[PDB]
Design a binder for this molecule. Structure first.
Ligand code: R78
Length: 126
Protein backbone atom coordinates (compact mmCIF):
# COMPACT_ATOMS: atom_id res chain seq x y z
CA UNK A 1 0.00 0.00 0.00
CA UNK A 2 1.56 3.27 -1.24
CA UNK A 3 -0.06 5.88 1.02
CA UNK A 4 0.94 9.24 -0.51
CA UNK A 5 -1.93 11.56 0.51
CA UNK A 6 -4.36 12.41 3.31
CA UNK A 7 -7.23 10.75 1.41
CA UNK A 8 -5.33 7.47 0.87
CA UNK A 9 -4.33 7.49 4.55
CA UNK A 10 -7.96 7.99 5.72
CA UNK A 11 -9.24 5.23 3.41
CA UNK A 12 -6.64 2.80 4.81
CA UNK A 13 -7.17 3.90 8.42
CA UNK A 14 -10.92 3.20 8.31
CA UNK A 15 -10.49 -0.21 6.61
CA UNK A 16 -7.99 -1.19 9.36
CA UNK A 17 -10.28 0.07 12.17
CA UNK A 18 -13.16 -2.01 10.70
CA UNK A 19 -10.96 -5.14 10.75
CA UNK A 20 -9.95 -4.56 14.37
CA UNK A 21 -13.58 -3.98 15.51
CA UNK A 22 -14.63 -7.13 13.61
CA UNK A 23 -11.88 -9.18 15.34
CA UNK A 24 -13.61 -8.51 18.73
CA UNK A 25 -16.35 -11.06 17.82
CA UNK A 26 -14.01 -13.96 18.76
CA UNK A 27 -12.51 -12.21 21.78
CA UNK A 28 -15.01 -13.33 24.40
CA UNK A 29 -18.23 -15.30 24.75
CA UNK A 30 -20.04 -12.05 25.85
CA UNK A 31 -18.47 -9.76 23.09
CA UNK A 32 -21.71 -9.88 21.07
CA UNK A 33 -23.52 -7.90 23.79
CA UNK A 34 -21.60 -4.78 22.68
CA UNK A 35 -22.35 -5.21 18.98
CA UNK A 36 -25.88 -3.81 18.59
CA UNK A 37 -27.85 -0.95 20.09
CA UNK A 38 -29.32 -1.62 23.53
CA UNK A 39 -33.07 -2.24 23.25
CA UNK A 40 -35.50 -0.49 25.63
CA UNK A 41 -37.44 -3.81 25.84
CA UNK A 42 -34.48 -5.33 27.67
CA UNK A 43 -32.98 -2.30 29.51
CA UNK A 44 -35.62 -0.11 31.01
CA UNK A 45 -34.25 3.29 31.92
CA UNK A 46 -31.11 2.82 29.83
CA UNK A 47 -31.56 5.94 27.69
CA UNK A 48 -32.65 7.96 30.77
CA UNK A 49 -29.11 7.45 32.13
CA UNK A 50 -27.08 7.10 28.91
CA UNK A 51 -27.22 10.19 26.63
CA UNK A 52 -24.31 9.18 24.33
CA UNK A 53 -24.91 5.50 23.66
CA UNK A 54 -22.32 3.59 21.63
CA UNK A 55 -22.05 0.10 20.19
CA UNK A 56 -19.63 -1.66 17.87
CA UNK A 57 -21.81 -1.81 14.67
CA UNK A 58 -22.25 1.97 14.93
CA UNK A 59 -18.46 2.36 15.06
CA UNK A 60 -18.19 0.10 11.97
CA UNK A 61 -20.75 2.34 10.19
CA UNK A 62 -18.75 5.46 11.13
CA UNK A 63 -15.55 3.83 9.70
CA UNK A 64 -17.39 3.07 6.42
CA UNK A 65 -18.35 6.81 6.22
CA UNK A 66 -14.71 7.76 6.98
CA UNK A 67 -15.80 9.76 10.05
CA UNK A 68 -12.74 8.82 12.14
CA UNK A 69 -10.08 11.43 11.15
CA UNK A 70 -7.70 10.37 13.96
CA UNK A 71 -6.89 7.76 16.59
CA UNK A 72 -8.34 10.09 19.27
CA UNK A 73 -11.75 10.40 17.46
CA UNK A 74 -11.87 6.60 17.31
CA UNK A 75 -10.78 6.06 20.95
CA UNK A 76 -13.33 8.66 22.17
CA UNK A 77 -16.11 6.34 20.93
CA UNK A 78 -14.42 3.21 22.29
CA UNK A 79 -14.18 4.99 25.70
CA UNK A 80 -18.00 5.45 25.67
CA UNK A 81 -18.59 1.70 25.48
CA UNK A 82 -16.65 1.20 28.75
CA UNK A 83 -17.98 4.36 30.46
CA UNK A 84 -21.65 3.59 29.73
CA UNK A 85 -21.16 -0.03 30.73
CA UNK A 86 -19.57 0.89 34.10
CA UNK A 87 -22.10 3.57 34.97
CA UNK A 88 -25.28 1.73 34.02
CA UNK A 89 -24.37 -1.77 35.29
CA UNK A 90 -21.97 -0.97 38.20
CA UNK A 91 -18.19 -1.27 38.06
CA UNK A 92 -18.17 -4.85 39.46
CA UNK A 93 -20.83 -6.14 36.99
CA UNK A 94 -19.39 -9.04 34.93
CA UNK A 95 -19.93 -7.18 31.63
CA UNK A 96 -17.47 -4.49 32.78
CA UNK A 97 -14.46 -6.82 32.54
CA UNK A 98 -15.62 -7.79 29.02
CA UNK A 99 -15.88 -4.12 27.94
CA UNK A 100 -12.41 -3.33 29.38
CA UNK A 101 -10.95 -6.45 27.66
CA UNK A 102 -12.48 -5.23 24.33
CA UNK A 103 -11.09 -1.74 24.96
CA UNK A 104 -7.52 -2.81 25.75
CA UNK A 105 -7.44 -5.43 22.98
CA UNK A 106 -8.61 -2.87 20.38
CA UNK A 107 -6.13 -0.19 21.52
CA UNK A 108 -3.26 -2.68 21.33
CA UNK A 109 -4.27 -3.75 17.82
CA UNK A 110 -4.26 -0.13 16.59
CA UNK A 111 -0.55 0.09 17.52
CA UNK A 112 0.07 -3.13 15.50
CA UNK A 113 -1.45 -1.71 12.27
CA UNK A 114 1.22 -2.15 9.53
CA UNK A 115 2.31 1.43 8.64
CA UNK A 116 0.28 3.12 11.41
CA UNK A 117 2.97 5.87 11.85
CA UNK A 118 2.80 6.71 8.11
CA UNK A 119 -1.02 6.67 8.24
CA UNK A 120 -1.07 9.03 11.25
CA UNK A 121 1.52 11.33 9.56
CA UNK A 122 -0.61 11.83 6.43
CA UNK A 123 -3.80 12.18 8.59
CA UNK A 124 -2.05 15.22 10.20
CA UNK A 125 -1.81 16.86 6.71
CA UNK A 126 -5.60 17.67 6.73
C1 R78 B 1 -28.13 -2.84 29.00
C2 R78 B 1 -27.14 -3.17 30.09
C3 R78 B 1 -26.13 -4.23 29.66
C4 R78 B 1 -25.19 -3.61 28.68
O1 R78 B 1 -24.36 -2.81 29.13
N1 R78 B 1 -25.25 -3.92 27.39
C5 R78 B 1 -24.29 -3.32 26.43
C6 R78 B 1 -26.14 -4.91 26.93
C7 R78 B 1 -26.26 -5.28 25.60
N2 R78 B 1 -27.10 -6.26 25.22
C8 R78 B 1 -27.84 -6.98 26.09
N3 R78 B 1 -28.64 -7.93 25.54
C9 R78 B 1 -29.66 -8.66 26.09
C10 R78 B 1 -30.14 -8.42 27.38
C11 R78 B 1 -31.16 -9.17 27.96
C12 R78 B 1 -31.76 -10.23 27.28
C13 R78 B 1 -32.87 -11.04 27.92
O2 R78 B 1 -33.45 -11.85 27.21
N4 R78 B 1 -33.25 -10.85 29.19
C14 R78 B 1 -34.34 -11.56 29.83
C15 R78 B 1 -35.68 -10.85 29.61
C16 R78 B 1 -36.81 -11.47 30.43
N5 R78 B 1 -36.46 -11.53 31.87
C17 R78 B 1 -37.57 -12.12 32.64
C18 R78 B 1 -35.23 -12.30 32.11
C19 R78 B 1 -34.05 -11.69 31.34
C20 R78 B 1 -31.32 -10.52 25.99
C21 R78 B 1 -30.31 -9.80 25.36
O3 R78 B 1 -30.02 -10.23 24.09
C22 R78 B 1 -28.82 -10.06 23.32
N6 R78 B 1 -27.77 -6.67 27.41
C23 R78 B 1 -26.93 -5.71 27.87
N7 R78 B 1 -26.96 -5.35 29.20
C24 R78 B 1 -27.38 -6.29 30.26
C25 R78 B 1 -27.17 -7.79 30.04
C26 R78 B 1 -28.50 -8.46 30.36
C27 R78 B 1 -29.51 -7.40 30.80
C28 R78 B 1 -28.90 -6.07 30.39
Amino acid sequence: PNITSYTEALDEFCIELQRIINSTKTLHHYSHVFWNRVSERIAPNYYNLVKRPMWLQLMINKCKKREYKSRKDFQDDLDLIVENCKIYNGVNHPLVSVATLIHSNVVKKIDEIQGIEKIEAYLSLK
